[PDB]
């Protein structure tokens, strides 16, 4: 117990000095109106706060479903083959069996999904970790939608694949952190919202 | 310092929480010093509540001069801010 | 009798009570007795006009 008391009485001062030093080193670093993080001299510390430009208060852990799925399971959960698959129209108010343009849209969707899975598994989270803090709890919003609209699992939906693709693309186009018609502004916007876009596309696959 | 054109503005179109606090405080301070109120009063006596109800109706006659790191700035009306 | 036509500047502080439609008439008279955007002075509420 004496050792414990001594450790307390010393650690208090140690950490007090550490915190004063830490605050003095970064007191001038502030987020600017162009999205960049700079110090009092204008030197850029980061080009986007946290590399995504989000307040740490508002982020919540989300699970990436496509990361740990096998290729077979990934295909099962995301691949739509209207030529071989007919169960899709069983879930829909409108028949889309053997439709060419809809199949083209689905193929573009699946190509983007496979690209996103490749980028996740190879570049971002090669260790296979799926739970990461992102903006917006999308799963909670989906649960809220299921509860609010009394969605009956037995009721065919009036949503067409094109509706889903266009809506998700427009949403992704409305997640603006950086504004500007330049090229590197587009690049930084895409990078900042890349992981969120991957999660959104994995959640809202047709 | 050069003023940016209204069409060229690149900053966020939303009112920041710091901007909201500053705007409410400044308008409340001006009201406390007998600045004419641009909203109908239902018997409120606190200048801060008067400024809040002015804000809800976007009736605060104030601008925000957001400065870019290089010194160029953008003027945003409290009314047009989201 | 050398008379010079010159452009000059002054910094007028205005009380919040005057912040109405007739703000600019008041400033001109004050300038004559003694227009840029009005900078609201932090902590005081006045508006500085150049």
């Amino acid at each position: 117990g004496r050792e414990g008391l001594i450790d307390t009485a010393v650690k208090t001062a140690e950490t007090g000095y550490i915190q004063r030093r830490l605050v003095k080193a970064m007191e001038d670093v502030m987020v600017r109106y162009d999205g960049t993080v700079r110090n009092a001299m204008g030197d850029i510390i980061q080009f986007a706060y946290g590399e995504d430009g989000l307040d740490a208060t508002l982020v919540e852990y989300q699970v990436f479903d496509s990361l740990r799925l096998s290729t077979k399971q990934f295909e099962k959960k995301y691949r739509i083959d209207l030529m071989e698959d007919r169960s899709l129209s069983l879930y829909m108010e409108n028949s889309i069996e053997n439709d060419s343009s809809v199949q083209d849209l689905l193929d573009e969707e699946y190509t983007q999904l496979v690209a996103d899975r490749e980028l996740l598994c190879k570049f971002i989270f090669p260790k296979g970790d799926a739970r990461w803090p992102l903006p917006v709890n999308v799963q909670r919003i989906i649960q809220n939608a299921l509860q609010i609209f009394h969605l009956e699992a037995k009721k065919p939906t009036d949503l067409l694949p094109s509706d889903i693709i266009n809506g998700l693309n427009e949403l992704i186009a409305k997640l603006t952190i950086f504004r500007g018609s330049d090229r590197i502004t587009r690049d930084v916007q895409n990078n900042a919202t890349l992981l969120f876009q991957i999660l959104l596309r994995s959640k809202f696959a047709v | 310092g050069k003023a940016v054109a209204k069409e060229d503005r690149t900053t966020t179109p939303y009112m920041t929480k710091y901007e909201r606090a500053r705007i409410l405080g400044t308008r409340a301070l001006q009201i406390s010093m007998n600045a004419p109120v641009l909203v109908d009063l239902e018997g409120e006596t606190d200048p801060l509540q008067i400024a809040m109800k002015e804000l809800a109706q976007k009736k605060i006659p104030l601008l925000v001069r957001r400065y870019l790191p290089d010194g160029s700035y953008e003027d945003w009306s409290v009314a047009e801010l989201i | 009798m050398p008379f010079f036509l010159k452009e000059l500047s002054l910094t007028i502080s205005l009380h919040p009570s005057y912040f109405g439609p007739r703000m600019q008439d008041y400033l001109k008279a004050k300038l004559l007795a003694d227009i840029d955007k009005g900078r609201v002075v932090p902590g005081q509420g006045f508006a500085e006009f150049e």
């Binding site: - | 710091y18 705007i23 925000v64 | 912040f19 609201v40």
Partner: peptide, 15 residues
């Protein structure tokens, strides 16, 4: 809260 400056909009004070 002081990362910006507040100005009057006289266009609104007219109306």
């Amino acid at each position: 809260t002081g990362a910006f400056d507040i100005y009057l909009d006289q266009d609104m004070l007219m109306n």
